[PDB]
RNA sequence: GUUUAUUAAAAACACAGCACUGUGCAAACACGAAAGUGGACGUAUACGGUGUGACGCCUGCCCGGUGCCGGAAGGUUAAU
RNA sequence: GCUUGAGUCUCGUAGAGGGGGGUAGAAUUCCAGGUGUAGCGGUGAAAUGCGUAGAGAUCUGGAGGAAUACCGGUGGCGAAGGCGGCCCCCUGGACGAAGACUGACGCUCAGGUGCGAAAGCGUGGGGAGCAAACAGGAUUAGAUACCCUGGUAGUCCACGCCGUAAACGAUGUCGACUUGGAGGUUGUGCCCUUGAGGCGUGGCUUCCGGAGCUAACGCGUUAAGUCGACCGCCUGGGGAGUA
């Protein structure tokens, strides 16, 4: 979560958010409880996840 | 163990009884009985001050320990009794020195059942101990509001009393009111709840039964002509007035509260 | 992996903040990838690991 | 008579008192003919995440094999104990000897 | 299910001998251990009724092996069934 | 006034608004500017530029403190954060620490249903 | 069940049950120039007041008026 | 009688199978307090709402309830409904390896009995979040809606009831035979284990396809192919799964 630098440092450059937090973790838990469009969810995820 | 008695004769048909097996079938301890003479609601002018009181059984006063001050000496319970001047059960208990004692009977316990009044205590249901050494968030019934003067909250039927805070030399306790009160640290209480909490499941059924508890009939006041109360009269029915008391002053509503010398010990009053 | 008290090997599956690695990305076997996890769980308990890295 | 592994932690300020308690919970583990397999002080270890606040603590690690009463009576020790924070007891998974 | 030595103390009583683990009265006591002593596990618990469906295949596998011995030898059949105390 | 000379700018960047509270090393909040406060109500207050403005003028407001360095926590996903974090060292500020403090549950209270648009 | 002893026994009163409201104990409340007493040797699962009146299905909208509860800014406001 | 069906015993394996008890960490809400100050929240835009009685932001302490991120996977377990932190206790099943034992003890099953999501009902608790009803704000021609701000039953626990779902692989159960390929998961045997290998042999499962079947679509060794046993059900649409 933190980042720090020594003196060479110019730019943010922090994509350590871009691996874990911001992009879907907190956007998938601002609506609804279901159970039962996240299996259909990870079930067409999975299903598109071919060759 | 609530009972719906089956509906022979009406009358019985909508009573509810809260029977008790592990209670004594029998006699109660008897140096620890004494005379309760019935009033009528009546004080030593011989007027009637509180109203609706009147006949019922004879009763027998039963000295129940408040205090509970013989500390550090063990006692185990003897048996449970019925008393008939509360809603709560009696334990007898016996200390280990000879001496009977009744006690009121928190919800847990039972015949052959070891409790001990005292500071150093086991924290567990029954052993009435002061508040400085009882845990923040117990469940704590029979508790004392002036240190040495025996207990005053908590006591009926199926109720305990929340300790919340130790800020200093008090502590502050939800009452069963909803009220948060600051009481002296130092005052003891009792660990648990008081064990009769079936107690209002109980209906009662018919009118007589209420009258076995002497409680004569309430009449209403609309009922009443204009000299007798407030509402009076008036020719089929008519109410008209805003409720009160046959004394004048409102009912539904007004607050009757009046102390400022106990203002300072109540920290929210109830909602 | 079968045990949890050593927390080289546990610190080496798991991210910076505190978060269990898929199997997707470390390899391990699913057998051990669930032997991991519960151990990671059972030392997170006893305060040999964070749950976290803003406790 | 079946395996178990305890570890528990204790509250720094009582650390002097930690030995004796050990040798007491030993000696109820042989109260009951249960053998003891390894016995570990772990010392005074930095916690991962604050308890109580409380930062650094002292662990002890026992693996006992003993019938499940005494373990059960164990735990309520640990219960009631203001010394030990964390306890935490396990499986058989056969009597272990080694370090870690 | 059952412990090692139960099992084994109940092959030894019930069998021609050891290692006959596989006779009808065995299977019988056998089943008849573990149904009894369940009835200690579900007196309490009492909503545990994914173990009461394997319970009530020990039930009726009990049954049709008694059903079997019946048709097969009635003497052994009369001398098991005293011997468990079943059938009431 | 009482020269506190490090703190941490926390950055709570939401979906509508970005509110940027500079405070100390304590916990103690020294001075703080919304996006929504600097003019542009509305769409235009949920914007990185609406977020920068919001920093800048957090930035003023705390001269009494000769803050040099400070550390920032970001919450909230949000079109601000990014473009904050930027005007705080355009505005003479020694950025230290950039931590992402956004309180994730561990599956815990139930989210809202919403939003069937 | 009770009631107009002596023209009214009833659909009226009562009632169990329900609800609202007051009451933290030196309780509210009542009798009492006061002391005191009843409430109660009870303690909010208790006690007082008010309405409705077993049980079953239910109890809709209105807070402008009158009351009550709460608020404290401003206006007005006694003795001094 | 016999062992190739069915079952018992020995040793292990994997598992969110069940029931009871305890505990842990994040987060939401509330309460008390510190800093601090003019907005916060919300939306397509707004307003209702909260806020100088000091909100929102931020830090500290506390209470409480529910759910258990990451692992997490057309992964696993369960007859089905379903089951997801960690630990203990009680407990069910499955599968594998070699050997021993019983000896057809088997398959299906009308009536019968049991289990059976969610909502709902009864009694007693609990009540943080979410949220039918409800209220207000908008939107609109209207808006008893979608959107916003609140919000009660309910959701949570104990015991009892109900007895249903697109309770669905829209595919009854049991058994036998019939070309293949790529995976996943869990056992086991053999070989320089000369490593994250090579060769087999089981259990469960996913995708694609051959013959065959099929109205077609598709199914395709887990069949909707080729057969056998027993059960359940169908007979034009509506009326009506109603009286």
Not at chain 2, 77 to 98: C, F, M, Q, T, W
Request: charged fraction near 30%; glycine fraction near 8%.
């Amino acid at each position: 979560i933190k980042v720090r630098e020594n003196e060479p440092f110019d730019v943010a450059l922090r994509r350590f958010k871009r691996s874990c937090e911001k992009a879907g973790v907190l956007a998938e838990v601002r609506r609804r409880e279901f159970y039962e469009k996240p299996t259909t969810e990870r079930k067409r995820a999975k299903a598109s996840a071919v060759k | 163990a609530v009972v719906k008695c089956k509906p022979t004769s009406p009358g019985r048909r909508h009573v509810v009884k809260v029977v008790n097996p592990e209670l004594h079938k029998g006699k109660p301890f008897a140096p620890l009985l004494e005379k309760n003479s019935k009033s009528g609601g009546r004080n030593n002018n011989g007027r009637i001050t509180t109203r609706h009181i009147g006949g019922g059984h004879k009763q027998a006063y039963r000295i129940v320990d408040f205090k509970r001050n013989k500390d550090g000496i063990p006692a185990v319970v003897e048996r449970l009794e019925y008393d008939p001047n509360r809603s709560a059960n009696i334990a007898l208990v016996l200390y280990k020195d000879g001496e009977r004692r009744y006690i009121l009977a928190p919800k847990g316990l039972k015949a052959g059942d070891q409790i001990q009044s005292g500071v150093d205590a086991a924290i567990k249901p029954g052993n009435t101990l002061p508040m400085r050494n009882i845990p923040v968030g117990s469940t704590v019934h029979n508790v004392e509001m002036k240190p040495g003067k025996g207990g005053q909250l908590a006591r009926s039927a199926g109720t305990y009393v929340q300790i919340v805070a130790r800020d200093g030399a008090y502590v502050t306790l939800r009452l069963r009111s909803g009220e948060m009160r600051k009481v002296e640290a130092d005052c003891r209480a009792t660990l648990g709840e008081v064990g009769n909490a079936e107690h209002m499941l109980r209906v009662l059924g018919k009118a007589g039964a209420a009258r076995w508890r002497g409680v004569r009939p309430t009449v209403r006041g609309t009922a009443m002509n204009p000299v007798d109360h407030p509402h009076g009269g008036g020719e089929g029915r008519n109410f008209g007035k805003h409720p009160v008391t046959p004394w004048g002053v409102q009912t539904k509503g007004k607050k009757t509260r009046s102390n400022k010398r106990t203002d300072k010990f109540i920290v929210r009053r109830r909602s | 992996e079968i045990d949890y008290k050593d927390i080289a090997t546990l610190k080496n599956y798991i991210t910076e903040s505190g978060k269990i690695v898929p199997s997707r990305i470390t390899g391990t076997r699913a057998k051990y990838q669930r032997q991991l996890a519960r151990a990671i769980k059972r030392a997170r308990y006893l305060s040999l690991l964070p749950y976290t890295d803003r406790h | 008579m079946r395996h178990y592994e305890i570890v528990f932690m204790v509250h720094p300020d009582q650390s002097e008192q930690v030995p004796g308690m050990i040798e007491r919970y030993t000696a109820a583990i042989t109260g009951a003919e249960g053998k003891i397999h390894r016995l570990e002080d772990w010392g005074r270890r930095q916690l991962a995440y604050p308890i109580n606040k409380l930062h650094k603590a002292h662990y002890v690690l026992m693996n006992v094999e003993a019938p499940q009463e005494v373990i059960d009576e164990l735990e309520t020790t640990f219960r009631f104990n203001d010394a030990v924070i964390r306890s935490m007891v396990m499986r058989t998974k056969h009597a272990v000897t080694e370090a870690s | 299910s059952l412990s090692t030595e139960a099992t084994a103390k109940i092959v030894s009583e019930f069998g021609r001998d050891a290692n006959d683990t596989g006779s009808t009265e065995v299977q019988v006591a056998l089943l008849t251990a573990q149904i009894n002593h369940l009835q200690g596990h579900f007196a309490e618990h009492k909503k545990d009724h994914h173990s009461r469906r394997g319970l009530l295949r020990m039930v009726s596998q009990r049954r049709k092996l008694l059903d079997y011995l019946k048709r097969k030898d009635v003497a052994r059949y009369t001398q098991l069934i005293e011997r468990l105390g079943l059938r009431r | 006034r009482k020269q506190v000379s490090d703190g941490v700018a926390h950055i709570h960047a939401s979906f509508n608004n970005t509110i940027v509270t500079i405070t100390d090393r304590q916990g103690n909040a020294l001075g703080w500017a919304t996006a929504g406060g600097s003019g542009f109500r509305g769409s235009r207050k949920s914007t990185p530029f609406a977020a920068q403005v919001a920093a800048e003028r957090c930035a003023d407001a705390v001269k009494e403190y000769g803050i040099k360095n400070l550390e920032v926590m970001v919450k909230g996903p949000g079109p601000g954060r990014e473009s904050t974090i930027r005007a705080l060292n355009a505005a003479g500020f020694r950025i230290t620490n950039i931590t992402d403090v956004t309180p994730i549950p561990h599956n815990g209270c139930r989210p809202p249903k919403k939003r069937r648009v």
